[PDB]
Design an enzyme around this catalytic site. Structure first.
Site, PDB file in Angstrom:
ATOM      1  N   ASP A  74     -15.437  -4.810   8.918  1.00 25.15           N
ATOM      2  CA  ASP A  74     -16.654  -4.333   8.198  1.00 25.15           C
ATOM      3  C   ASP A  74     -17.326  -5.460   7.402  1.00 25.15           C
ATOM      4  O   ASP A  74     -18.410  -5.215   6.842  1.00 25.15           O
ATOM      5  CB  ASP A  74     -16.340  -3.163   7.262  1.00 25.15           C
ATOM      6  CG  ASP A  74     -17.559  -2.354   6.838  1.00 25.15           C
ATOM      7  OD1 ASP A  74     -18.398  -2.031   7.705  1.00 25.15           O
ATOM      8  OD2 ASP A  74     -17.674  -2.095   5.651  1.00 25.15           O
ATOM      9  N   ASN A  95      -9.091   5.048   2.801  1.00 26.83           N
ATOM     10  CA  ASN A  95      -9.821   5.720   1.703  1.00 26.83           C
ATOM     11  C   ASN A  95     -10.743   6.778   2.327  1.00 26.83           C
ATOM     12  O   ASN A  95     -11.459   6.433   3.279  1.00 26.83           O
ATOM     13  CB  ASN A  95     -10.540   4.641   0.879  1.00 26.83           C
ATOM     14  CG  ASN A  95     -11.142   5.114  -0.425  1.00 26.83           C
ATOM     15  OD1 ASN A  95     -11.390   6.286  -0.603  1.00 26.83           O
ATOM     16  ND2 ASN A  95     -11.423   4.198  -1.339  1.00 26.83           N
ATOM     17  N   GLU A 144       0.868  -1.209   0.000  1.00 29.56           N
ATOM     18  CA  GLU A 144       0.000   0.000   0.000  1.00 29.56           C
ATOM     19  C   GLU A 144       0.894   1.245   0.000  1.00 29.56           C
ATOM     20  O   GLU A 144       0.597   2.194  -0.750  1.00 29.56           O
ATOM     21  CB  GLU A 144      -0.964  -0.019   1.193  1.00 29.56           C
ATOM     22  CG  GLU A 144      -2.040  -1.084   1.067  1.00 29.56           C
ATOM     23  CD  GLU A 144      -3.064  -0.886  -0.038  1.00 29.56           C
ATOM     24  OE1 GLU A 144      -2.937   0.109  -0.781  1.00 29.56           O
ATOM     25  OE2 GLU A 144      -3.929  -1.784  -0.224  1.00 29.56           O
ATOM     26  N   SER A 174     -11.860  10.031  -4.526  1.00 27.62           N
ATOM     27  CA  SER A 174     -11.448   9.857  -3.119  1.00 27.62           C
ATOM     28  C   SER A 174      -9.915   9.756  -3.111  1.00 27.62           C
ATOM     29  O   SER A 174      -9.311   9.658  -4.194  1.00 27.62           O
ATOM     30  CB  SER A 174     -12.124   8.656  -2.505  1.00 27.62           C
ATOM     31  OG  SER A 174     -11.631   7.480  -3.107  1.00 27.62           O
ATOM     32  N   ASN A 177      -7.673   8.169  -5.897  1.00 22.32           N
ATOM     33  CA  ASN A 177      -8.471   7.099  -6.549  1.00 22.32           C
ATOM     34  C   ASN A 177      -9.227   7.695  -7.751  1.00 22.32           C
ATOM     35  O   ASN A 177      -9.584   8.902  -7.735  1.00 22.32           O
ATOM     36  CB  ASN A 177      -9.417   6.399  -5.553  1.00 22.32           C
ATOM     37  CG  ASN A 177      -8.750   5.839  -4.317  1.00 22.32           C
ATOM     38  OD1 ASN A 177      -9.167   6.160  -3.198  1.00 22.32           O
ATOM     39  ND2 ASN A 177      -7.695   5.048  -4.494  1.00 22.32           N
ATOM     40  N   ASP A 206      -6.459   7.931  -0.833  1.00 25.49           N
ATOM     41  CA  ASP A 206      -5.950   6.924   0.124  1.00 25.49           C
ATOM     42  C   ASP A 206      -4.807   7.562   0.906  1.00 25.49           C
ATOM     43  O   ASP A 206      -3.907   8.158   0.276  1.00 25.49           O
ATOM     44  CB  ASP A 206      -5.491   5.664  -0.610  1.00 25.49           C
ATOM     45  CG  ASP A 206      -6.636   4.779  -1.080  1.00 25.49           C
ATOM     46  OD1 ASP A 206      -7.818   5.076  -0.755  1.00 25.49           O
ATOM     47  OD2 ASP A 206      -6.323   3.769  -1.759  1.00 25.49           O
ATOM     48  N   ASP A 208     -12.294   7.465  -8.390  1.00 22.04           N
ATOM     49  CA  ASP A 208     -13.639   7.959  -7.981  1.00 22.04           C
ATOM     50  C   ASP A 208     -13.519   9.354  -7.348  1.00 22.04           C
ATOM     51  O   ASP A 208     -14.582   9.886  -6.926  1.00 22.04           O
ATOM     52  CB  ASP A 208     -14.371   6.971  -7.067  1.00 22.04           C
ATOM     53  CG  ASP A 208     -13.746   6.789  -5.695  1.00 22.04           C
ATOM     54  OD1 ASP A 208     -12.719   7.400  -5.448  1.00 22.04           O
ATOM     55  OD2 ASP A 208     -14.278   5.994  -4.890  1.00 22.04           O
TER      56      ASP A 208
END
Ligand code: NA
Length: 129
Positions: free
Chosen positions: A101, A59, A35, A50, A46, A52, A48
């Site tokens: 989650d 995120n 990562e 967003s 990202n 990280d 979209d």
């Protein structure tokens, strides 16, 4: 901060990540390697829109607030900037929520594609833990 491999392994263990939701310490170190390359200051946009943040590339779409991710949530109730600190406490606290989650460490696509099923023990080899 760019952590050493064993340095990060010691910090994650101290913060209770070793075998958290059944994931051994080497899974967490492997995720951090792919990562962030163990760099607390790592940020990556990202597709979209967003971002990280930090050693585990948490995120802004769901987990932290960065003020620029429309329709997003802040489920760890932290500014995303808090995830870039040399002290990994906030990243670890937030990662415990993520991995809880429902999909475990599959939440980290780099974990699923590069760590899952591999000899993740290798990542804590030689470390005094
Ligand atoms: Na957010």
């Amino acid at each position: 901060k760019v952590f050493g491999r064993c340095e990060l392994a010691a910090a994650m263990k101290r913060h209770g990540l070793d075998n958290y939701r059944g994931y051994s310490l080497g899974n967490w170190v492997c995720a951090a390697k792919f990562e962030s390359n163990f760099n607390t200051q790592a940020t990556n946009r990202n597709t979209d829109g967003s971002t990280d943040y930090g050693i585990l590339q948490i995120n802004s779409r769901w987990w932290c607030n960065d003020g620029r991710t429309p329709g997003s949530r802040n489920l760890c109730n932290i500014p995303c900037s808090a995830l870039l600190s040399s002290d990994i406490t906030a990243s670890v606290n937030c990662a415990k929520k993520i991995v809880s989650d429902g999909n475990g460490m599959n939440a980290w696509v780099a974990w699923r594609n590069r760590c899952k099923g591999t000899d993740v023990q290798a990542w804590i080899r030689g470390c005094r833990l």
